[PDB]
């Protein structure tokens, strides 16, 4: 797919301060927490100590029927990029070289208050770059109504329940779960956050040009007298 | 590679184990040969909807509706071209004032406009019937064949183009979305151009009638998504055209600081 | 220290004994799974409002409105700057008098003031929706978090600045008093500048309509209290500007000798 290679260019966000964010979008940077499960927001967002990106997009249940304000539930889909090694010495974020990805974590949350339905889906790919076919290194974790508890591995009796790897499921013509998973959700999910990451940087990069132009404009006010 | 040149969804007709199975089955039914029999239970007869012959047949019906609906548009262009050709060829012996031309020329346009809009609805019915033939096939094995992918794209392509002229923009949204989920159709800019207009059309309707902001953002978001996506697929990224669209979307959407 | 960095009120995921209690209750609801259940008595279901997930959704609902409402103010300023820029760039090929320029200048100031009052009302609608979402959270523990006090103050500040542009001074007094009681917001001088003006407006209306002097004394006193407080927080005590305000207040108030 070569998509995750293009995600390597998104390391410029570490040394660039984030001011322009789209509606219902949350982004910050920090250091990996214990066990490398998630990211912990650093107190300073410009230091080289940070090695991770956190990006969250949240929505509301009932926005498809105009009842978003009715408080029918909450949902959010967020993805993170894990980087290895320290940042470059210079603090300029314009010139940053592509860097490898430790792992790509996909988090899906969807809770319905009235139906008392809650779906939490976690997808982690510990081998983003290095091998085009790394199915066995893709961890899937499905939780439904707080069952099973976090960290419970898949059992042969309950297939698909709990944390497991992508290679467990079949790719038969009868139930091509794996092939559909790549075509239906995974390919579109990566591209959606790929464009969004570029969307955030270009917006904040543009504001750098304007403030240079704003100073030029106020200086021309002296030419009239 | 031409999928339509095949002329069939799949050519349906080896193993001695299978051949021996065929011989014993045909003789069981030959003893029960009752050509006038009609089963009281439809469940066993419904299994024929999964056969290759059934799918090889519904493909022809949709194709016939598609091919006939093509001729409606094709013949309409020939008529209009011949119509305006004859208007300038016949002598106008009673024409000596300037405003005579303006009214006569304007009369031709209303004649031509009636011809085109009549052709569209005449062609649209063939396209709509073609859709119902494709959606009733229940063989997922034969739904991924190249022939099915080509025709379902061509039927949807002509269906959306014809529906656009009748100002039925909101009805093209479900068909357009199903069109961009087949093969490399998502890489074509025209498919994303209509989505920009269609979602803009729905955006105005909620805006005009003063609906909830929730549906406004949904149509506004999908508008900007396929407006920028169509820009990428025509001029390329980081093009001067692409840069201007971002500024337009910049004021259009909502940002947080 | 960005309180709204994570975009949530309180983070959500320990004791093995507590982990055991959550196990048995979760298994109890497994037997009684009924998505179609609707309680006749809502008292039990209304206790869900105290849950952390309830406050997370309410906070992000109010946060969503704030981003949209603030965008209205920012987009309006962007267009006003753009509109003024375009006006000076277009060529006036039919203007050769000084009074013509003044009338043309008065046209733009009418258009700009027309758009601002339209923009403020659109923004004020969004900020009102954000306020209501914050007021339907009934957990005092979650009402003291840094995330909560950040958004409640930011919403009020953007709400009052939008309200004052629409000449609705008397509505700002109840909101201003609630703003100066959150964290160290009482230390800000701008929050006391609007209080000085709002109580001055009520001072005039009571005097103009020949109302009771009791409401006049109360509103006059509140004006002097916050007028002096605003100068103290900006120009500092025992400063020449502070000395000037003491002269006005002593002149304006009643002193018994």
CA distances from C208 to A178, C172, C189, C203, C219 (A): 78, 20, 29, 9, 14
Q: State the number of CA atoms in the 13 A half-sphere of B208 facing the CB.
A: 6
Residues of C in contact with B256 (CB under 8 A): 67, 70-71
Q: Which residues of B227-238 are buried (b: 16+ CB within 10 A; e: fewer)?
A: bbbbbbbeeeee
Yes or no: say if B175 and B164 are a contact pair by the CB < 8 Å rule: no
C61 and A68 within 8 Å at the Cβ level: the answer is: yes
Cα B193 from Cα B208, distance rounded (Å): 22
What residues of chain A lie within 8 A of the CB of B214, using their CB?
62-68
Structure tokens that stand for A12 in this block: 């410029």
**Hey, are the CB atoms on B254 and C79 less than 8 Å from each other?**
no
Chain B: residue whose CA lies nearest to A69: B214
How is residue C39 annotated by DSSP?
Answer: -
Q: What subunits make at least 3 CB pairs under 8 angstroms with A? A: B, C
Cα A71 from Cα A111, distance rounded (Å): 11
State how far the Cα of B129 lies from the Cα of B72, in Å rounded to an integer.
Answer: 14
For residue A221, what are the β-bridge partners?
none
- Asked if B256's CB is within 8 angstroms of C67's CB, the reply is yes
The subunits that touch chain B, with at least 3 C-beta pairs less than 8 Å apart, are: A, C
Q: Rg of the Cα trace of chain A? A: 21
Q: How many CB atoms lie within 10 A of CB B113?
A: 11
DSSP code string of chain B: --SGGG-SS------HHHHHHHHHHHHHHHHT--TT---S-HHHHHGGGGSHHHHHHHHHHHHHHHHHHHHHHHHHHHHHHHHHHHHHHS--TT--SHHHHHHHHHHHHHHHHHHHHHHHHHHHHHHHHHHHHHTT---HHHHTSHHHHHHHHHHHHHHHHHHHHTT-GGGGHHHHHHHTTSTTGGG-HHHHHHHHHHHHHHHHHHHHHT--HHHHHHHHHHHHHHHHHHHHHHH-TT-HHHHHHHHHHHHHS-EE-
Whether A115 sits inside 8 A of C35 (CB atoms) is yes
Task: Please count the residues of chain B.
Answer: 257
**Cβ <8 Å between A74 and C53:** yes
Per DSSP, the three-state class of C92 is coil
Burial of A100 (0-12, 13-18, 19+ CB in 10 A): middle
Copy the structure tokens of residue C34.
């009924």
Q: What is the dihedral of CA A147, A150, A151, A154, to 10 degrees?
A: 10
| Side-chain-side CA neighbours of residue A85 (13 Å) | 9
- Residues of chain B neighbouring A68 (CB-CB closer than 8 A): 212, 214
Separation of alpha carbons B164 and B48, rounded Å = 37
CB contact under 8 Å between B253 and A23, yes or no, is yes
Question: Which of A84, A99, A79 lies closest to A11, judged by CA?
Answer: A99
B-chain CB neighbours of C71 within 8 Å are 254-256
Contacts of B179 (CB under 8 A, 6+ apart): B153, B156, B157, B160, B185, B191
Helices in chain C by DSSP H: which ranges?
16-31, 43-46, 52-89, 98-134, 146-165, 169-179, 190-208, 213-234, 240-252
- Using CA atoms, how far apart are residues B242 and B232, in angstroms rounded to an integer? 7
Q: Are B219 and B252 in contact (CB under 8 A)?
A: no
- Give the span between the Cα atoms of B242 and B235, in whole angstroms: 7
- Is the Cβ pair C71, A23 closer than 8 Å? yes
Q: Is A160 on the interface with B (CB under 8 A)?
A: no
B212 interfaces chain C, CB cutoff of 8 Å = no
Owner of token pair 């979602």: B199
Nearest to A32 by CA among A46, A18, A47, A42: A42
Q: How far is CA B69 from CA B119, B176, C195, in A?
A: 9, 19, 73
Helices B240-252 and C52-89 meet at what angle, rounded to 10? 120
What whole-number distance in Å separates Cα of residue A168 and Cα of residue A162?
A: 12
| Nearest of C53, C22, C44, C27 to residue A112 by alpha carbon | C53
Of the partner residues A68, A117, A149, the one whose CB lies closest to the CB of residue C35: A117
Breaks (C-N over 2.5 A) in chain B follow: 13
DSSP string, B161-227: HHHHHTT-GGGGHHHHHHHTTSTTGGG-HHHHHHHHHHHHHHHHHHHHHT--HHHHHHHHHHHHHHH
Rounded to whole angstroms, the Cα distance separating C246 from A66 reads 55
- For this experimental structure, what is the resolution in angstroms? 3.2
Backbone phi, psi, residue B74, to 5°: -65, -45
Among candidate residues B156, B173, B78, B66, the one with its CA nearest the CA of residue B116:
B78
HSE, CB side, 13 Å, CA atoms: give it for residue B128. Answer: 10
CB C61 within 8 A of CB C133: yes
Distance (Å) from the C-alpha of residue B130 to the closest C-alpha of chain A? 26
Q: How far apart are CA A72 and CA A61, in angstroms?
A: 5
CA distance B171 to chain A (A): 18
* Greatest pairwise CA separation for chain C in angstroms: 89
Of B211, B212, B255, the CB nearest to A21: B255
Angle in degrees, CA B119, B121, B125, rounded to 5: 115
Q: Which residues of A touch B253 (CB under 8 A)?
A: 22-23
Give yes or no for a contact between B256 and A21, defined as CB atoms under 8 angstroms apart. Answer: yes
Chain C CA closest to residue B250? C75
Instruction: Determine the residue of chain B that is closest to A18 in CA distance.
Output: B257
Q: Tokens in use for C49? A: 């409002």
Residues comprising chain A, all counted = 225
Q: What is the 3-state secondary structure (H, E, C) of chain A?
A: CCHHHHHHHHHHHCCCCCCCEECCEEEEEEEECHHHCCEEECCCCCCCCCCEEEEEEEEECCHHHCCHHHCCEEEEEEEEEEECCCCCCCCCCCCCCCCCEEEEEEEEEEEECCCCEEEEEEEEECCCCCCCCCHHHEEEEEEECCECCCCCECCCCCCCCEEEEHHHCCCCCCCCHHHHHHHHHHHHHHHHHHHHHHHHHHHHHHHHHHHHHHHHHHHHHHHHC
What b/e string do you get for C27-53 counting C-beta neighbours within 10 Å, with b at 16 or more? eeeeeeeeeeeeeeeeeeeeeeeeebe
Which residue, among C157, C148, C151, has the nearest Cα to C176 in the 3D structure? C157
Structure tokens at C256: 């018994």
> Tokens in use for C187?
């230390």
Beta carbons of C71 and B256 less than 8 Å apart: yes
Q: Which residue of A has its CA nearest to C2?
A: A43
Q: Which chain A residue is nearest to residue B252, measuring alpha carbons?
A: A22
**Could you give phi then psi for residue A17, rounded to 5 degrees?**
-70, 140
The Cα B131–Cα C143 span in angstroms is 57
- The answer to whether residue C77 neighbours chain B at the CB level (below 8 Å) is no
Q: Quote the minimal CA–CA distance from B252 to chain C in Å.
A: 9
The chain C residue lying nearest A118, using CA atoms, is C53
CA distance B215 to chain A (A): 6
In chain C, after which residues does the backbone break, taking C–N over 2.5 angstroms as a break?
13
d(CA C64, CA A59): 9
CB contact under 8 A, C71 and B251: no
CB neighbour list of residue B110: distance below 8 Å, 6 or more residues apart:
none
Cβ atoms of C138 and C147 closer than 8 Å: no
For C19, residues 6+ apart whose C-beta sits below 8 A from its C-beta are: A149
User: How many CA atoms lie less than 13 Å away from B80 in the CB half-sphere?
Assistant: 17
Can you tell me the distance from the alpha carbon of B70 to that of B61, in angstroms, rounded to the nearest whole number? 14
């Amino acid at each position: 797919s070569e998509v995750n290679k293009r995600l390597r260019l998104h390391t410029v966000l570490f040394k660039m301060k984030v001011r322009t964010l789209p509606h219902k979008t949350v982004l910050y940077k920090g250091k990996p927490s214990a066990d490398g499960e998630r990211c912990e927001a650093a107190d300073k967002q410009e230091a080289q100590d940070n090695t991770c990106l956190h990006l969250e997009v949240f929505d509301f249940v009932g926005s498809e029927d105009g009842k978003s304000s009715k408080n029918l539930g909450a949902k959010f889909k967020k993805m993170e990029l894990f980087f290895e090694g320290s940042n470059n010495a210079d603090p300029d974020p314009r010139k940053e070289q592509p860097r490898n990805l430790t792992k790509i974590r996909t988090y899906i949350y969807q809770n319905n208050f009235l139906l008392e339905d809650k779906v939490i889906s976690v997808i982690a790919d510990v081998a983003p770059n290095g091998e085009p076919a790394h199915n066995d290194k893709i961890e899937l974790f499905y939780q439904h109504d707080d069952y099973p508890v976090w960290g419970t591995p898949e059992t042969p009796s309950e297939k698909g329940v709990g944390k497991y790897i992508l290679s467990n499921v079949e790719n038969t013509k009868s139930n091509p779960i794996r092939n559909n998973f790549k075509k239906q959700f995974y390919f579109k999910n990566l591209d959606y956050f790929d464009k969004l990451f570029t969307k955030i940087f270009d917006y904040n990069d543009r504001d750098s040009n304007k403030h240079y132009k704003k100073n030029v404009e106020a200086l021309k006010g002296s030419l009239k007298y | 590679v031409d999928e339509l040149l095949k002329g069939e969804l799949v050519p349906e007709n080896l193993t001695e184990d299978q051949k021996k199975k065929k011989k014993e089955i045909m003789e069981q039914e030959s003893l029960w040969k009752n050509p006038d029999f009609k089963g009281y239970n439809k469940t066993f007869q419904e299994l024929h909807q999964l056969s290759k012959t059934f799918a090889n047949n519904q493909f022809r019906l949709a194709l016939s509706n598609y091919q006939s609906g093509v001729n409606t548009i094709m013949k309409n262009r020939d008529w209009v071209e011949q119509y305006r050709k004859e208007e300038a060829e016949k002598k106008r012996l009673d024409e000596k004032w300037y405003w005579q031309k303006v009214d006569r020329k304007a009369r031709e346009e209303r004649v031509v406009y009636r011809e085109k809009m009549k052709a569209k609805q005449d062609a649209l019915n063939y396209f709509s019937k073609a859709i119902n033939h494709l959606d009733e096939i229940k063989n997922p094995d034969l739904r991924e064949r190249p022939e099915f992918k080509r025709l379902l794209s061509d039927v949807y392509r002509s269906w959306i183009m014809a529906e656009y002229d009748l100002q039925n923009l909101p009805q093209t949204i479900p068909i357009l979305e199903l069109y961009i989920e087949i093969d490399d159709n998502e890489k074509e800019y025209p498919a994303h151009k209509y989505l920009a207009s269609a979602y803009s059309f729905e955006e105005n309707m909620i805006k005009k009638t003063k609906g909830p902001d929730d549906m406004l953002f949904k149509y506004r978001y999908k508008k900007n998504v396929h407006l920028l996506r169509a820009t990428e697929l025509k001029y390329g990224k980081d093009s001067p055209e692409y840069k201007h669209i971002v500024n337009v979307i910049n004021r259009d959407e909502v940002i947080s600081v």
